[PDB]
Design a binder for this molecule. Structure first.
Ligand SMILES: NC(=O)c1ccc[n+]([C@@H]2O[C@H](COP(=O)([O-])OP(=O)(O)OC[C@H]3O[C@@H](n4cnc5c(N)ncnc54)[C@H](OP(=O)(O)O)[C@@H]3O)[C@@H](O)[C@H]2O)c1
Ligand SMILES: NC(=O)c1ccc[n+]([C@@H]2O[C@H](COP(=O)([O-])OP(=O)(O)OC[C@H]3O[C@@H](n4cnc5c(N)ncnc54)[C@H](OP(=O)(O)O)[C@@H]3O)[C@@H](O)[C@H]2O)c1
Lengths: 287, 287
């Protein structure tokens, strides 16, 4: 379609999403707290609205790409009288319960609301590897599906506005924790004079094979199948201890490896040392 | 090659390494704290030594596959008089400084010592995807290299007996932390009724693309290049906050997400909110 889209928030993601939408033939009206930041997308065909009200009134679809949901309230408060009959799609990080309350806030101002969690960095927006989680009213998703698909293949999760946000937080839980561990291991090796340039390829090389190493688990966790034939919590917990020890001696952050160590210690304390590592999920669920 | 090899410790890794060595034509003499556990490898051609001394005396190469280095002292103490002239290869998890002291202990008993860290699970032992870090005397590595290659491609790191162990701990830092985060995210989604069988493929699907998403870092960390064009610590820190918040509300472990949150808080506190996420390594290095 060539339906008009409004996009508020021109960080790298809003800029990429704007460009994707322009390339696909949508007129895009933008607004940004910092108008100078819109110069690039305006040169590429975006229209810079002078005020939030003007931006909101430009289209029946308002996409938000902001750091958090407080930013949505900040920018849309002067425009709440212009929301009726439009769909707000918030593509921003926050808690699921912030998101759920925001959806009701939209309804109160006469708008529909969809939650989106964009699952790739800005350069990958609008490519074949892009995808976005969505949740909220099915009818509102279907209405805008074809426009939204320009950004990334949609994965609709259902009616709960919180759910796409929960999926995003869970995905970023894995992503951010993995990244922190890469920096932690890089730091640890750096302590014996190993370059990050030497370290990081070794660590990434291993990380690339992790899905495979795991398959050499979801249903098993659901089925309580935690058998320790090829790797026990005892043995992995010992390695967790060795990492804490090495970290202590290296003088680097202890909080991250200690959180991991605790997952194993809890499982052993509860009498499941002989089980597979998936067993640590029980202590995680019940601190 | 057909050099005789002794392997002590018949967990899944010792069993796999024994079988790989037998398949490649090496006579393998085994000993285990629990002799019944050797029935399988003996059926496949291994010789079960009655005592640790007998096992050590069977060959010039003694491989240890035990949960930690204390286990090495436990099993080899009765046999310290039979170590002279032989090479101990310890393929067990422990701290780098435990490893370094153990190497000197071997030297005092007239043996040579090599550190190894086996980087794949037991089913992948002896396959084209297997690899093992080694460190210790170059001459001792060269002497046994062709036997050791049966287990996996060697990656020799140099003379410091601690270094292959530090590499192993840094690798398992990433691997265990990644796994903990998978279980953490699985738990978080399970809190809204999402199955692990539904959750885990979504999480793995994302994890598979992490090397790619990163390239869409080592030399930059070495060069202090931490520019926040496409993703800032401010923005990623906010998501870390949202994960903590979602975790609080879900009633799951807070220690793991809080350790990640702290990486970001520290960087912002030190005035680097505008930087790329790699900047968290500075606070990690200086707790
Ligand atoms: N970058 C990524 O790779 C990536 C990937 C997927 C998801 N995300 C998510 O996408 C969203 C946008 O991220 P991003 O990296 O593009 O950018 P960002 O650094 O979060 O900035 C996005 C926009 O937020 C605006 N903003 C922040 N606080 C505001 C406030 N209180 N009032 C008004 N405007 C406010 C900024 O305004 P100014 O321009 O005036 O500073 C900017 O336009 C975030 O929720 C993030 O978690 C990011
Ligand atoms: N499993 C993997 O996927 C994997 C991958 C790479 C590296 N590793 C490392 O490889 C090593 C072996 O791990 P694994 O999973 O094969 O097995 P494991 O569960 O660590 O057990 C290995 C052996 O240790 C013995 N043992 C432990 N404590 C002992 C003690 N105090 N005295 C004597 N024997 C003792 C056990 O004796 P019993 O048989 O009598 O119980 C068993 O034979 C570990 O250091 C682990 O970190 C494991």
């Amino acid at each position: 379609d060539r339906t008009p889209v409004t996009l508020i928030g021109l960080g790298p993601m809003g800029q990429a999403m704007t460009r994707a939408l322009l390339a696909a033939g949508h007129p895009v009206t933008v607004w940004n707290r910092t108008p100078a930041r819109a110069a690039g997308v305006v040169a590429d065909g975006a229209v810079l609205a002078a005020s939030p009200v003007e931006a909101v009134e430009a289209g029946d679809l308002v996409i938000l790409s902001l750091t958090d949901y407080q930013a949505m309230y900040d920018v849309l408060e002067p425009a709440t009288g212009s929301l009726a009959g439009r769909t707000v799609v918030n593509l921003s990080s926050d808690t699921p319960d912030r998101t759920r309350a925001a959806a009701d806030w939209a309804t109160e101002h006469g708008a529909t609301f969809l939650t989106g969690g964009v699952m790739i960095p800005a350069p990958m927006v609008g490519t074949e590897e892009a995808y976005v989680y969505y949740s909220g009213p099915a009818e509102v998703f279907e209405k805008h599906r074809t426009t939204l698909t320009v950004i990334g293949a949609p994965r609709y999760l259902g009616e709960d506005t919180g759910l796409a946000q929960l999926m995003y937080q869970a995905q970023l839980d894995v992503f951010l924790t993995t990244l922190s561990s890469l920096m932690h291991a890089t730091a640890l090796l750096g302590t014996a004079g190993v370059s990050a340039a030497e370290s990081m390829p070794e660590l990434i090389g291993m990380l690339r094979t992790v899905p495979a190493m795991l398959e050499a688990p979801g249903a098993d966790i659901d089925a309580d199948k935690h058998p320790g034939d090829l790797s026990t919590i005892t043995m992995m917990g010992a390695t967790a201890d060795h990492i804490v020890g090495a970290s202590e001696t290296a003088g680097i952050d202890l909080a991250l490896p200690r959180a991991v160590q605790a997952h194993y210690r809890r499982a052993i304390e509860n009498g499941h040392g002989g089980d597979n590592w998936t067993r640590i999920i029980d202590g995680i669920r019940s601190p």
